[PDB]
Amino acid sequence: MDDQGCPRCKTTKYRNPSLKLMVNVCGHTLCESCVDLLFVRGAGNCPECGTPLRKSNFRVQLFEDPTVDKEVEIRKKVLKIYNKREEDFPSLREYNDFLEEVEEIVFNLTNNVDLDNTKKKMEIYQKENKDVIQKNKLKLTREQEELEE
Amino acid sequence: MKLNVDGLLVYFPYDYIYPEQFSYMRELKRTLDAKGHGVLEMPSGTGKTVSLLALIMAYQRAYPLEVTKLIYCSRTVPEIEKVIEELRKLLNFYEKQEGEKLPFLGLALSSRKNLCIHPEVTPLRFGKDVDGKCHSLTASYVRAQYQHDTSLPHCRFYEEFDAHGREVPLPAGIYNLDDLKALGRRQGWCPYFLARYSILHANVVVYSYHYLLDPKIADLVSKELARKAVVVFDEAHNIDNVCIDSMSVNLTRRTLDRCQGNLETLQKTVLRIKETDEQRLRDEYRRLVEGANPVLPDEVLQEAVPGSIRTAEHFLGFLRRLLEYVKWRLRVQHVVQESPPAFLSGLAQRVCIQRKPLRFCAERLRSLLHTLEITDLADFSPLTLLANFATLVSTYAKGFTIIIEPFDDRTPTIANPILHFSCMDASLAIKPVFERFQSVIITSGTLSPLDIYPKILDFHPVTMATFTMTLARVCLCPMIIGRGNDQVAISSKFETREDIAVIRNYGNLLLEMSAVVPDGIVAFFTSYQYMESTVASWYEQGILENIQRNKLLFIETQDGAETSVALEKYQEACENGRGAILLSVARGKVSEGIDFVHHYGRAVIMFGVPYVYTQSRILKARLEYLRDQFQIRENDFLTFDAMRHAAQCVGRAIRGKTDYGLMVFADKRFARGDKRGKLPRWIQEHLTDANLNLTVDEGVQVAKYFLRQMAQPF
Amino acid sequence: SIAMQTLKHMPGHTSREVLIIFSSLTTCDPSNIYDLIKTLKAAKIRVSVIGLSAEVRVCTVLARETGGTYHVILDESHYKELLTHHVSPPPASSSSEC
Numbered sequence: 001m002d003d004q005g006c007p008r009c010k011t012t013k014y015r016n017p018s019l020k021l022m023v024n025v026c027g028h029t030l031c032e033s034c035v036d037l038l039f040v041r042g043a044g045n046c047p048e049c050g051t052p053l054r055k056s057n058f059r060v061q062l063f064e065d066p067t068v069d070k071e072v073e074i075r076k077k078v079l080k081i082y083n084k085r086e087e088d089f090p091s092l093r094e095y096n097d098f099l100e101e102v103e104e105i106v107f108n109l110t111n112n113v114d115l116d117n118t119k120k121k122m123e124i125y126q127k128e129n130k131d132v133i134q135k136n137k138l139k140l141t142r143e144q145e146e147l148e149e
Numbered sequence: 150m151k152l153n154v155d156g157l158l159v160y161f162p163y164d165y166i167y168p169e170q171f172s173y174m175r176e177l178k179r180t181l182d183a184k185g186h187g188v189l190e191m192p193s194g195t196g197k198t199v200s201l202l203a204l205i206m207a208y209q210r211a212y213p214l215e216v217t218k219l220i221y222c223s224r225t226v227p228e229i230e231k232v233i234e235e236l237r238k239l240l241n242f243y244e245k246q247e248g249e250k251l252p253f254l255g256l257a258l259s260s261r262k263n264l265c266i267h268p269e270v271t272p273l274r275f276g277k278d279v280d281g282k283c284h285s286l287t288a289s290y291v292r293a294q295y296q297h298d299t300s301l302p303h304c305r306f307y308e309e310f311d312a313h314g315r316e317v318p319l320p321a322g323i324y325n326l327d328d329l330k331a332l333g334r335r336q337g338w339c340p341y342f343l344a345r346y347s348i349l350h351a352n353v354v355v356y357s358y359h360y361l362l363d364p365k366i367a368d369l370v371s372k373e374l375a376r377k378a379v380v381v382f383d384e385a386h387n388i389d390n391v392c393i394d395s396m397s398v399n400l401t402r403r404t405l406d407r408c409q410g411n412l413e414t415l416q417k418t419v420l421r422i423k424e425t426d427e428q429r430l431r432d433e434y435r436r437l438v439e440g441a442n443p444v445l446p447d448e449v450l451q452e453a454v455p456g457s458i459r460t461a462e463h464f465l466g467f468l469r470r471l472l473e474y475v476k477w478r479l480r481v482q483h484v485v486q487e488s489p490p491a492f493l494s495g496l497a498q499r500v501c502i503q504r505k506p507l508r509f510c511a512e513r514l515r516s517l518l519h520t521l522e523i524t525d526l527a528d529f530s531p532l533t534l535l536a537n538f539a540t541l542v543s544t545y546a547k548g549f550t551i552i553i554e555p556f557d558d559r560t561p562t563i564a565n566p567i568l569h570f571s572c573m574d575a576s577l578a579i580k581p582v583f584e585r586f587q588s589v590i591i592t593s594g595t596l597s598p599l600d601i602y603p604k605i606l607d608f609h610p611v612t613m614a615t616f617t618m619t620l621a622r623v624c625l626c627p628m629i630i631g632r633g634n635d636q637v638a639i640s641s642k643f644e645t646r647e648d649i650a651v652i653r654n655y656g657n658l659l660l661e662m663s664a665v666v667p668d669g670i671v672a673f674f675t676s677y678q679y680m681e682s683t684v685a686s687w688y689e690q691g692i693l694e695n696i697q698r699n700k701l702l703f704i705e706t707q708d709g710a711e712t713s714v715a716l717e718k719y720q721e722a723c724e725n726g727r728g729a730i731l732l733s734v735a736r737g738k739v740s741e742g743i744d745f746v747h748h749y750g751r752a753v754i755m756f757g758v759p760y761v762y763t764q765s766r767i768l769k770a771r772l773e774y775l776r777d778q779f780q781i782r783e784n785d786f787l788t789f790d791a792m793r794h795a796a797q798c799v800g801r802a803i804r805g806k807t808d809y810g811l812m813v814f815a816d817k818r819f820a821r822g823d824k825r826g827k828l829p830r831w832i833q834e835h836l837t838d839a840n841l842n843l844t845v846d847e848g849v850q851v852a853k854y855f856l857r858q859m860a861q862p863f
Numbered sequence: 864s865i866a867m868q869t870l871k872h873m874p875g876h877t878s879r880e881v882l883i884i885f886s887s888l889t890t891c892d893p894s895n896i897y898d899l900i901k902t903l904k905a906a907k908i909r910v911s912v913i914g915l916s917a918e919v920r921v922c923t924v925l926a927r928e929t930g931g932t933y934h935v936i937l938d939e940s941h942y943k944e945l946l947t948h949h950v951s952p953p954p955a956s957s958s959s960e961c
């Protein structure tokens with residue numbers, strides 16, 4: 001809400017801050033009053049960049065930094081992979097070592113081509129999906145429920 | 150004057166000692182004999198130090214193995230300076246009695262800003278600047294570059310010390326901070342580092358609490374070397390507040406904005422480094438895999454591995470993520486929110502920042518920031534504060550709390566919100582001191598009743614004694630005035646603050662008191678706003694003008710520069726016959742820093758019981774928590790917060806040399822039994838029911854009569 | 864100052880003295896009085912204040928630095944005692960010359 005305004009229509013923010021940033025594959029600031037401007041023509045196209053969007057690629061976000069939006073959103077998907085708990089590995093190095101590649105993948109996905117990452121992620125899928133992904137995914141609700149109370 | 154103490158024979162420089170000193174020394178020896186931490190109170194500002202210092206020295210000679218060394222801490226560097234004079238006098242007396250030098254060393258530490266010999270850092274006075282500048286000069290890269298002897302300003306004093314100071318330690322002697330500066334210049338060494346090394350072999354070391362409490366810098370010099378040492382805190386009744394300040398970290402939007410701007414430079418610097426020097430500086434990663442100072446104490450601090458942040462780019466993004474969360478978390482406009490454990494959970498859930506990688510964030514910053522060969526840490530200081538806040542939150546929140554204030558006080562609408570991380574209990578940060586050291590003696594003056602302190606600070610005291618000053622003459626004649634000339638209650642209650650009549654009584658009492666009281670008088674209020682309102686109300690009426698005629702009037706302000714000038718003029722007025730009336734606030738840094746002696750602050754006037762505003766949410770987490778844990782009533786601590794604060798600002802007039810003075814408290818609340826009991830014993834025992842609630846007119850007459858008695862010689 | 868001007872020209876042999884009966888503790892003066900003390904010591908003018916209902920600080924140094932004595936009135940009866948004491952000639956000190 002502290003931003004001066006939209007790159008195109010910088011008038012609604014001054015009047016009220018109720019408008020919230022909308023995340024997109026462009027990692028690219030947009031505003032609700034300006035979202036309607038995109039639906040009328042293009043229907044999922046960035047005004048200046050013109051990046052195509054499948055169905056509006058819109059989700060509410062409140063992080064003024066566009067890079068954080070992509071970094072945070074990408075990290076959300078990556079967390080679905082490599083979610084195995086630390087204690088699963090007795091080796092001291094292996095605890096945080098795999099997290100390093102996870103961070104590398106996130107940064108690799110942000111800017112560089114994800115084709116290598118997608119191909120790599122497929123290799124992990126064939127192995128992790130069987131036991132670890134299913135086990136940790138189910139246990140996420142159990143730990144979260146206990147943690148909340 | 151050799152004293153045949155029960156435990157042993159103890160020397161003493163001055164000719165005579167009052168009975169309280171005998172009680173003081175014997176009680177102190179009992180704690181030392183029991184080798185257990187304890188607390189005791191002594192009235193006199195001066196005289197206790199020599200008795201305290203002398204007894205420790207004698208005990209050291211009798212049982213040198215029992216006590217390795219003495220760590221005597223004082224509030225302020227100006228104050229700690231007065232202590233070394235007492236120690237220096239004692240050693241000469243002992244040296245003359247022995248007739249020869251003995252292997253005894255005593256030195257005082259201070260910040261590099263206070264004492265230093267490099268001309269470049271001399272003109273600058275900011276503490277951070279010297280630390281940033283000194284780090285650059287002493288930076289390993291400069292040291293490594295100094296070996297190359299390339300054309301670049303290199304600070305020789307550290308270099309010369311390394312070649313010389315390391316080989317030979319100073320034999321013995323006592324060196325003041327001002328004196329210690331001279332030695333560094335002559336020998337071409339650091340007055341700071343030379344003292345730092347001497348801590349390994351030094352009988353007495355003295356420095357303020359922030360050299361011994363904050364884990365960032367206290368731990369390094371307070372290492373396990375002093376496994377069994379007599380650590381002593383003097384006049385440390387405000388130890389919890391200072392102990393808490395060592396942990397509380399304040400995050401502000403302007404500070405946060407500076408962090409982002411600083412972070413932008415960090416990324417730019419990394420890019421330049423990669424193209425210029427990468428392989429050599431990439432070596433930091435290799436050691437990182439193997440595995441500004443950390444705020445985590447000895448046991449709490451962890452060094453297993455840095456975590457998922459193993460590279461500069463990875464770490465920098467981590468700060469960006471955490472900084473964004475704080476930026477957004479702060480921008481929210483809402484009522485004050487408290488979330489000690491939930492913030493960490495919310496931080497982890499919202500932005501995917503696990504606590505364990507966040508634990509080492511600050512520790513990784515110091516190592517990573519070092520590789521960048523930055524010009525100085527002063528520019529990036531705001532980022533470190535967040536980093537210290539970044540690691541601290543992830544470290545522990547059992548006895549802590551994050552307080553978010555979208556709106557600041559005294560402002561209906563302000564665009565500079567501040568996020569507080571105020572602690573709630575002081576036992577957490579001071580635990581290592583009690584645990585590490587065999588025994589700690591919290592010697593204090595004007596101490597409110599000792600029973601609360603063990604509750605606030607988790608320790609098992611050995612002795613709990615209150616020492617009452619005893620003199621052939623009644624040096625102090627305190628009184629409390631609750632009834633005015635109108636026989637009207639004069640309590641300075643919040644609802645009674647606006648009453649004009651109560652304000653009128655205070656002005657009239659000061660006018661009459663200023664008429665009879667000789668030159669030198671200080672009046673303490675409860676808050677700046679309340680002081681201004683009373684000052685303005687008096688200004689409208691003719692009371693204020695008359696006081697100006699009778700005696701000069703001086704007032705205190707928040708700005709330090711005005712305070713120093715006003716006080717500087719105030720001292721001159723006391724010397725001359727004009728006199729002066731210094732209005733001030735009990736919480737004012739002037740009240741704690743300043744010390745009043747003979748013909749200075751002759752009659753200390755207290756206008757209203759000193760209570761903090763009941764709206765500051767920070768005190769609530771501190772206050773309500775103490776009710777839940779350690780089982781202290783909110784009113785009990787709240788009143789204890791006033792008597793200790795009131796006693797602090799009224800016990801100055803009895804500094805030393807038996808200089809007369811009367812302490813008048815213009816509030817009927819002090820007449821209540823609860824306030825009187827929590828008052829220090831030495832003041833309270835002098836107080837009597839006859840003068841407990843003297844009227845304004847009645848109080849003045851006794852004040853005039855009492856001064857007459859003290860005017861005549863012994 | 865008024866006393867100093869008239870006593871400045873007095874003969875050296877005679878012992879100049881001043882007895883200030885100070886009543887109001889305040890002292891509003893055009894110039895700092897500490898400087899005037901330096902002149903008095905050189906002029907060897909003894910100033911022995913007798914304060915009233917107040918132990919004024921500035922006169923405390925005035926009496927002891929200049930050689931005089933400082934006192935405060937305990938009561939009316941004590942007041943007679945003090946002045947009568949000053950009637951007797953004061954002992955001549957080292958600074959005093961005959």
Ligand code: SF4
Pocket residue numbers: 261265266267270282283286287304306307338339341342
């Ligand atoms: S190395 Fe020593 S002399 Fe040089 S700036 Fe630091 S403290 Fe001062």
Ligand SMILES: [Zn+2]
Pocket residue numbers: 006007008009010030031033034035
């Ligand atoms: Zn727009």
Ligand SMILES: [Zn+2]
Pocket residue numbers: 026028046047048049050051
């Ligand atoms: Zn775009």
